[PDB]
Design a protein around this nucleic acid. Sequence first.
DNA 1: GCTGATGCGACGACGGATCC
DNA 2: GGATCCGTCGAACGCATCAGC
Length: 271
Amino acid sequence: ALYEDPPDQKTSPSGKPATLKICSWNVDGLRAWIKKKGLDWVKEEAPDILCLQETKCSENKLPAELQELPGLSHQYWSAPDKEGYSGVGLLSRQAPLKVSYGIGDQEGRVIVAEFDSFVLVTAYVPNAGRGLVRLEYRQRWDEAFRKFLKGLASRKPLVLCGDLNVAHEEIDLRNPKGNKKNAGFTPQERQGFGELLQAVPLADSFRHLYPNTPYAYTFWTYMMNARSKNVGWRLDYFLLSHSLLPALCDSKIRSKALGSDHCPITLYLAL
DNA sequence: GCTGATGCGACGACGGATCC
DNA sequence: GGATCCGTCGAACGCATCAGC
């Protein structure tokens, strides 16, 4: 069945107005994404902060359009050995207080940015691989990432966004039965997600607001016209510290924005 | 400099078995 | 014998390198 994201809820359940708009997007090739008008969609969304994953592009090769974003002028980029794979980016209206890269362990998968009242982490979580060939590495990465997140020295609440490369529960993908042995829906990856929520701790912004809504995905394989059929997976998330839930206005899935095999997601917080 | 081949990374459609 | 379950296989993309000119 197709899906239509509900209207933007820009007021917290208590009645306060959203003051921060964050957008996260696995662009699957930043230069390709830019040629497919991805940046015109970003300008329409007008977020305060924009996080990109799988840019596959070192900094010296960022297209000039990225220098013409006056509302997103503080930009931090991180790329891996394997040029052309992985790579993440964080663009912000306001300068962060602090920026770092990695999870303490140059893989180009994580950017950490401390703002006035919260710490933002954007992540491109390693894929378990076709045939699960890198599933054990993923499991080790999950555990190191949890530890890193828990151990963040700031007593500030946490927002974690990006492509976490797992559909947490059967409601998070179209074909759960035939994918329980595929990357992104193994019992090992699902358990790692549950442990991330438990240990840090974190809530899944979208599922907390829409706990029973099926067919909401953020990824569709390019092949077999899966997107047109909405055969997809929910792989991209905003996860929030418990204390941030009263500030949570909405968590969106921008199903119609093209340019990649993932669609943008967007968080509204009242801070 | 530019093109196209090739390599590499990132599952839904389908065919067959089992079950009541 | 429709529903389900299971394992097998080809395929849309982006980016790097390489060969050729």
